[PDB]
Design a binder for this molecule. Structure first.
Ligand SMILES: Cc1cc2nc3c(=O)[nH]c(=O)nc-3n(C[C@H](O)[C@H](O)[C@H](O)COP(=O)(O)OP(=O)(O)OC[C@H]3O[C@@H](n4cnc5c(N)ncnc54)[C@H](O)[C@@H]3O)c2cc1C
Ligand SMILES: Cc1cc2nc3c(=O)[nH]c(=O)nc-3n(C[C@H](O)[C@H](O)[C@H](O)COP(=O)(O)OP(=O)(O)OC[C@H]3O[C@@H](n4cnc5c(N)ncnc54)[C@H](O)[C@@H]3O)c2cc1C
Ligand SMILES: Cc1cc2nc3c(=O)[nH]c(=O)nc-3n(C[C@H](O)[C@H](O)[C@H](O)COP(=O)(O)OP(=O)(O)OC[C@H]3O[C@@H](n4cnc5c(N)ncnc54)[C@H](O)[C@@H]3O)c2cc1C
Ligand SMILES: Cc1cc2nc3c(=O)[nH]c(=O)nc-3n(C[C@H](O)[C@H](O)[C@H](O)COP(=O)(O)OP(=O)(O)OC[C@H]3O[C@@H](n4cnc5c(N)ncnc54)[C@H](O)[C@@H]3O)c2cc1C
Ligand SMILES: CCCCCCCC[N+](=O)[O-]
Ligand SMILES: CCCCCCCC[N+](=O)[O-]
Ligand SMILES: CCCCCCCC[N+](=O)[O-]
Ligand SMILES: CCCCCCCC[N+](=O)[O-]
Lengths: 431, 430, 431, 431
């Protein structure tokens, strides 16, 4: 067992830090003057253009598929550096990565070649989005006997027709509400959308993923695809994740990701399990920013006392708990991503590890930011420090990419409940 | 022992709710539109005028002093209802209350009568501020051997001269940056403001409090009193609590609140012990708003499943924890304000109770808001729900009115370490 | 609103402390040398004898019913003082009190006068036990479609015939395994115990309570009532709560507490809601003992340093935390018992307050003891301090009298789910 | 960065598992009959003999020094498996390992050759003990202006003379109160024990360590070395860490382990740093046994309901939390021991990492046992399940090997305060 970083892992960090410091620090001056979510998002376009130019979008795609991703650990390192400085743009990169993943994970080389092309070219500002979440919620999308996804699709001739609404998926409307360059739309197959999901059929068998592009949207009537709204968010105020309605929206059969059913569900689950693990690096980044700002402050400020405040046990106890939370978090993220990369391991073992990671890292980052604020004191409450921004941004993490209470805990629970569950298979191997 | 509310307590509640619902709900339409902290504060003025007109400033001053305060439990009830709806303006009322406290608590009838008069008139929009906080911090303001307060005062003939900077005291500059109608400025006495506090004298023996009005400022050179900035805050975005510089600022000796020393410090400490307990009510208001919003949501929303999410044990667990936090918090605040009004109890028993209250209620209010969000899920993160506002507002409480880590835990620790510490005196008698 | 204590409340406290300090402090010398649970229990009899003699058992019975209980706050004060010194015998007093509660709460004057008489007499060592808990568990006893209680009762002629097993009910076998002076035995009515509970009938409608005395047992075959074992507990090692098997045990119809059904369930629910509130006083006593020991230590010991350890912020932080938990706990207990006594409030309002109290005070008492131990340090771990006893005793409280996880949180959840739930009705009145 | 275990790492786990299951499981039948701490400890002698015969003592010594230790990760894995089954004897191995450490670490191959010899032999039952802890505490042993250690040494001719008392150090009196085969006695150098430590001297400059063997004790008057008592412990009831008084105790100057002062303190610090990282493996073992018993129960018991209790969200939530705590803990220990082995890192980096690990793993192991108990419910409180023993055992860990509050948190606090503190040095390398 080994924790040493390769020169390429160290270079990835250096590269990521430099990008964050020289480019991402300039974003605030641009987006701060904009007075709604979309305007703020549009104001980050030149930074994502720079991200593309720096090869960061290409680094979201595995090398066998023509990308530049060296490993998930490299990716983890990069995301922590980006998020420790500025989630603006950084969030758009990971959202794109997630949007690309169903394609990256499917086993069709020609679909891959076709749809990944703009993302590996190193040019423009191509956006991807995994359009799963809905206005009515999704924690119970797989519940047998429940309503299921409210976005449904039916086959009509050589075409699929999408009806319903998505809400939350980052990048989904593109820069201009004419659509992301690639959206993966998750639907429940239904021949009559006005009829409830058949309670005698397993919801996972009815799942389909349809690839929707700018061209797809252009080939539809204008009111077949509409942005109804854009949520004003507590934090991550420069991201876009609109309320989209599909009305009789036509998609060619060649844009179906795979045969509807368990294989389509498996592509979604795999992608959200990859993300579950990697989201820990975003949480670490945000919390580390908090911990470091508090650490620096505590080692150079006496707060009208005679000694630096890090010398008070109560202040140091906070910084200690923060440090422990960040250290355990990163270890768990690195464990999770290498587990996911281990071909000798069963899915359920990878999934369990990925759920734990999401749950821990995201809950604990919140505590870390709040403890840092408490240690710094009143000064952390004003926007000449970064804590107000960090507080709002860190609270996204336990809620997003499938919230801990409704989704991640439940997925983990289902695995632990399995008769052949091996708690330590990822550590000591399978018996 | 009894928990039943009297007719006037129930009516105090009815009256605070009605004012919050009919008046305070309209404030956001005005302030949200504004560009910066000061202008948001200014957009709040008509709502403070309505508060005055509803007798809510008069209710901050005891009846013997010509006010209408019925009791601290009434006060707790009012603050909870107010903050459960809208901290804007509500914050201004309680900051005024605090600014009034050292005058209320001194026993100089001529001073009370002179300086409390605008606040009991039921007219205008008079503001008070207790100016204690500084740019360099105040958690160590009484540390023997430390530099102490950096706002100092010196006697020159029949007046006092203030040299230094305050930061954070709410209302301190008034509506227009020409001053609160009354400010109590806490200074360290120093003959020479360049000489470091004498390491051999107890800092508490050097505390003075000087009363400063808009008239006091007007009678000084323009540059004697400078507003240098206005913090942009995470939450409570409509409050003013500027950065103020006093440079050779002249104050009549008759505006000195009491004799410098333990008595002046004792006034500040008592003022802040009373606020310590009452901020619990503010915390409960905010946390209660989160809990009730989450509860209604969980009882009416299935999140695309077959049952309301309250039926999921993990959701219910969060709401149970929120409910428990709120219920224990309110009990402790009422216990505290009740303990503070008990003439039979000695100061350290009251102070300890008050410290306990600020610490518990403010820490636990934050967990309550976050657990409420986690229960609601993704939808709590967007501004068409209250939670984004509540999250930012609730984090103020463990940090402000003397933060828990540096101030309140240290005050409490000092009491507990005394030889004659009686942990259960407030309950089981001395 | 008022927190001042009356002379009789202050006297109740003085009396309980005096008894604890002069009688109960002597119990350790006697049970410490016994070899098993039952012997330690039996070694306790003289102290229970003294408790009776001191009026403490009579004080478990309301004044209208011939007892001397002045109120539930009085009760709370007393229990805190007892458990702050020695849970031995104290636990026997409270278990009896629970045993007496379904009789206390029925509205049959002749039954009360009859069955409560030994307990109001001021003489003997009479024990009572509410026999609810079962080897298979009881968290799901009212689950529709479940197996229900495995102790069943059927009517045969003019008597009832109990079949099944109880586990845990304190005092149930009495001092000598010939039975408690009064045992309230909760059964599920079933005509054929070898057939499963009907999944179409609400389990609450089938609940019966049969009073079983030492005479009832004497009038049965010796093998119809068997003590099969006595659990060795981590703490409260002087209590007896045996494994009891009923095999065709005949009970007179005049021993039926009420018509089987929702009234019988209601009596059990009300008994356990009252205990749920009062058990908080037990938790507070135990954790107060931990806190006071730690506090006296911190104020008198420098641990090889220059100053008393209370001067260290981290130690003080623990004690502060202990203090807050104790203070909030006792307030909540007083709130809850006063709520239970308020004739103007709906039951669900009383139930909810009672559940909250049990959940909070019991969970928080565990943290309090543990934090006290951490503050004292290594010395807390040896049996020449109270802590090792306190640790084992405190861990009982979240688990017993309806565990928090399986029972109390589920009872509270059910009330919160109701359409007419008023969160603050106990504070601000109902609408 | 790699987490894969080698065949030798897998073999060490199998081996340790086989040992715990075939040998350690039998220990309880012997020690449970004994009536005091020392008797129980002596009853474990046959099992320590077996441990020597399995080469487990030899494996506490590095290969360069003639032992069989393969790595610190090997050692972590072994201690986890041992403590998961039975901390009796397992504690004695680990106490001996700590005892040997200052010798293992010193600059003297001749001292190493001489004193380690009986431990690498593979026969008998040799015990080591690092004797640092005292009746008055040690958290402030290095405080300038404080009384310092109360076990003191003066040089008298060509011998050293020990005056003072020790309390807590495991194995110190050996099997028979005639001494551990090897004991490293940590002393404060004081020409006159009657005089207070000089407030002008850095206490660290006055530290000496004297090796004391059974021979050393035999060459002294009966009352120069006396056992005043043996603490009765809450858990780990089969260890010995007695109260020891040295009255004019003579020790040859050749037995002086190194030059008194910063170098001697260095060896003690380094030894306790290593134990700090490795006690997490003990804590994990105990918590893991709690988690696994609770998991198996949750997956096979319905508690009188229609489904296994793991299906209840609240129960699963407890198991999830336990799992997360165990996973993050193990990762941290492996990171800590690997960091300790890294020759390229500054000492303070290794020290901070070891402190982190001790604090986190030990605090979180207690939470993990208590959660497992809450999930199982009332059943967990009786001694026919492991929990009562585990609860008592787990509470040792935050308190022992330098309690978290007094020692480990302050050692970490000192590191973080240093101008050149590098929080991420153990991960991302030093600047
Ligand atoms: C910055 C950002 C980026 C985003 N990017 C994307 C994206 O790229 N793609 C995408 O599809 N979405 C995206 N979203 C949404 C995100 O993935 C959310 O996690 C998702 O909407 C699910 O929300 P939820 O977990 O609260 O589930 P919900 O269904 O909304 O449930 C809400 C709450 O209900 C309760 N609950 C419901 N069911 C249960 C149950 N069975 N058991 C216990 N509790 C239950 C829980 O408390 C849960 O938290 C994004 C959101 C944000 C803020
Ligand atoms: C909305 C609002 C209204 C306000 N109104 C007023 C007002 O009306 N009047 C007024 O005077 N002020 C006011 N303030 C300020 C408020 O009272 C702050 O609590 C006050 O500034 C003290 O801050 P602090 O506790 O963080 O101490 P600081 O001295 O600023 O110290 C900050 C941190 O340093 C650490 N620290 C410093 N010393 C120690 C120590 N000895 N031991 C352990 N840790 C230590 C702690 O972690 C502490 O949290 C207001 C602030 C806000 C946001
Ligand atoms: C099973 C077992 C095995 C053991 N084996 C050994 C062994 O092999 N060798 C050995 O030397 N000892 C051994 N001991 C002792 C063990 O290492 C203890 O941790 C050690 O005695 C120090 O205890 P302590 O941390 O509680 O410090 P103490 O000095 O006893 O301090 C007690 C408490 O005071 C407070 N405190 C004191 N000073 C400060 C401070 N400056 N700042 C903040 N808080 C403070 C803290 O709350 C602390 O927990 C063993 C004990 C047990 C139970
Ligand atoms: C000192 C002492 C005195 C006692 N006195 C009495 C007495 O006087 N009378 C008496 O009847 N008993 C008595 N008992 C038992 C006590 O009342 C227990 O709390 C009771 O047995 C119920 O146990 P439980 O809550 O763990 O439920 P169980 O049915 O044993 O279930 C245990 C666990 O399973 C899980 N679980 C089961 N169902 C659910 C669910 N639906 N939802 C979520 N989780 C679930 C929970 O994690 C729960 O903790 C005593 C015990 C002790 C130690
Ligand atoms: C690298 C994968 C990280 C995905 C983060 C984007 C958030 C999507 N979401 O909230 O579901
Ligand atoms: C009733 C008193 C409430 C306290 C006023 C809040 C601002 C004061 N402060 O933060 O120091
Ligand atoms: C009145 C207080 C009742 C406590 C009885 C003792 C335990 C009962 N129980 O665990 O169910
Ligand atoms: C290498 C393992 C070290 C653990 C030694 C046992 C207790 C030591 N202690 O308490 O300091």
């Amino acid at each position: 067992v080994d924790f040493k970083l390769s020169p390429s892992q160290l270079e990835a960090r250096r590269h990521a830090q430099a990008f964050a410091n020289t480019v991402l620090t300039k974003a605030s001056a641009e987006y701060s003057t904009q007075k709604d979510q979309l305007s703020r998002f549009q104001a980050t376009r030149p930074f994502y253009r720079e991200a593309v130019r720096h090869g960061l979008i290409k680094a979201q795609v595995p090398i066998p598929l023509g990308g530049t991703m060296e490993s998930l650990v490299h990716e983890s390192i990069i995301l922590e550096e980006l998020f420790a400085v500025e989630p603006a743009t950084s969030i758009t990169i990971v959202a794109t990565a997630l949007g690309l993943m169903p394609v990256i994970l499917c086993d069709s080389p020609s679909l891959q070649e076709k749809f990944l092309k703009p993302f590996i070219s190193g040019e423009g500002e191509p956006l991807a989005s995994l359009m799963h979440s809905e206005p009515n919620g999704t924690a119970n999308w797989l519940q047998k006997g429940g309503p299921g996804l409210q976005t449904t699709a039916r086959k009509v001739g050589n075409e699929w027709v999408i009806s319903g609404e998505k809400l939350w998926p980052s990048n989904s409307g593109g820069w201009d509400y004419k659509g992301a360059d690639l959206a993966c739309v998750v639907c429940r197959v239904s021949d009559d959308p006005s009829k409830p999901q058949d309670p005698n059929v397993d919801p996972a068998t009815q799942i389909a993923v349809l690839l929707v592009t700018r061209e797809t949207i252009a080939n539809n009537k204008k009111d077949a695809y509409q942005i109804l709204g854009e949520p004003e968010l507590a934090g991550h105020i420069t991201t876009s994740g609109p309320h989209t309605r599909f009305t009789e929206f036509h998609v060619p059969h060649e844009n179906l990701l795979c045969t509807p059913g368990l294989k389509a569900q498996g592509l979604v689950e795999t992608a959200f399990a990859m993300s579950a693990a990697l989201v820990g690096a975003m949480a670490i980044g945000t919390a580390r920013a908090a911990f470091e700002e508090a650490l620096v402050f505590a080692k150079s400020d006496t707060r009208g006392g005679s000694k630096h405040i890090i010398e008070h046990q109560s202040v140091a106890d906070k910084l200690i708990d923060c440090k422990i939370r960040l250290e355990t978090s990163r270890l768990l993220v690195w464990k999770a991503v290498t587990t996911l990369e281990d071909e000798a391991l069963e899915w359920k073992v990878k999934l369990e590890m990925a759920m734990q990671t999401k749950i821990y890292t995201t809950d604990v980052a919140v505590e870390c930011v709040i403890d840092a604020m408490k240690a710094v004191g009143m000064k952390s409450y004003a926007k000449d420090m970064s804590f107000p921004r960090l507080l709002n941004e860190v609270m996204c993490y336990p809620l997003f990419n499938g919230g801990n209470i409704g989704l991640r805990r439940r997925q983990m629970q289902r695995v632990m409940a399995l008769e052949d569950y091996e708690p330590w298979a990822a550590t000591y191997g399978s018996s």
